[PDB]
Subunit: 119 residues, 4 copies
């Protein structure tokens, strides 16, 4: 259910491959923030989920550095894939910026993203 | 250079990571228990060209809590920064999401924080 | 300010709040079931002089999950912003902390999000 | 009785709180250098009849960052538990939401953690 292209509510495009033993690999393209073009993503998912109607736990990380720019920051998404006719990946995310020690307390933004298979 | 090696959490957990020249993090996370049955694959990303100014290096990684022995139907992501020097640290916040039914989705995700050091607590 | 009145969560919950002239939020939160054992005191604060540039109005509140009928030994805080207009919303993220032993403190806190609207979902 | 008094954050901030018989938290938060332009109203709730099994006492509170002297158009909520004994502490996680435009809403909310103690660190 997981492998393929996913779209967030704000325009961002997540292209992922789910490996048979739990690897997530792919690319992320953000429509907002200090970002441009595509960024490598890597993560993990539960490759043997329950069959009781539960979602499939997963997570991945993007470091906001590519050949175009470097935002000195990284976002992790943690959530679950929910299959069926209206399939979705429901996430919460943490975006941590590299900071000085004086600004560490404000290094990390939190949010949520629901991804769907259609725009 | 600074990131690659072994890191210890405040409560006994250990992880060993290699930081690739182009931003990959790969390694193993070992829950406090200490045995093989408590070792899990870790994968993530870091800023491989960080600011050269005394600021942290941004990073994140994921562990799905499934290995050859156990499966919690859960995954944790840590988001943070590495701070180098005599008392080097990785300061993180994490989210642990469990697979749930739709009715219980509201209570799927735990949040916390952890500081990792190069020496045991 | 547009905050005073009734708000509805995505999953059935209702709260009724008064926003005081000097930044107080006071009211009652009613869990989705809306029976008589589902009402709890809420208290919080908001920006009583927000920006006039089109920005939202920052606010937060807490409910401790104890009333005359039951005690869940837990508390939720919501942090967010009020957005006024034809489709007014309060956009929030929340943290629900349960009383735990030290051993289980790592799993004490759930995180989530909710959007409150002036009409039912 | 355990909660009422002065608490110190790791970073230098101070707050003074009274815990009411029926679950109210009321007080003042001081972000250094505390004189007045640094003092803010805090209000929240706590579990006034916590479990007797060794669990912490759940609580939460909000500060909107406006006073008679300044206004940051933001609000922080802390969610945590009070743990009593010789080394009493309030262990929290917090959310700080700023008023934003709709375009900037995605970056409206900071997350962190604060452990408060009865002696300054």
């Amino acid at each position: 259910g997981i492998t393929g292209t996913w779209y967030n509510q704000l325009g961002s495009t997540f292209i992922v491959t789910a490996g048979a033993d739990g690897a997530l690999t792919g690319t992320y393209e953000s429509a907002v923030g200090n970002a441009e073009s595509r960024y490598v993503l890597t993560g993990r998912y539960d490759s043997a989920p329950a069959t009781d109607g539960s979602g499939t736990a997963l997570g991945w990380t993007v470091a906001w550095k590519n050949n175009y720019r470097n935002a000195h920051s990284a976002t992790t998404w943690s959530g679950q894939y929910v299959g069926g006719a209206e399939a979705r990946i429901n996430t919460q995310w943490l975006l941590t910026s590299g900071t000085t020690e004086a600004n560490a307390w404000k290094s990390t933004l939190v949010g949520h993203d629901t991804f769907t298979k259609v725009k």
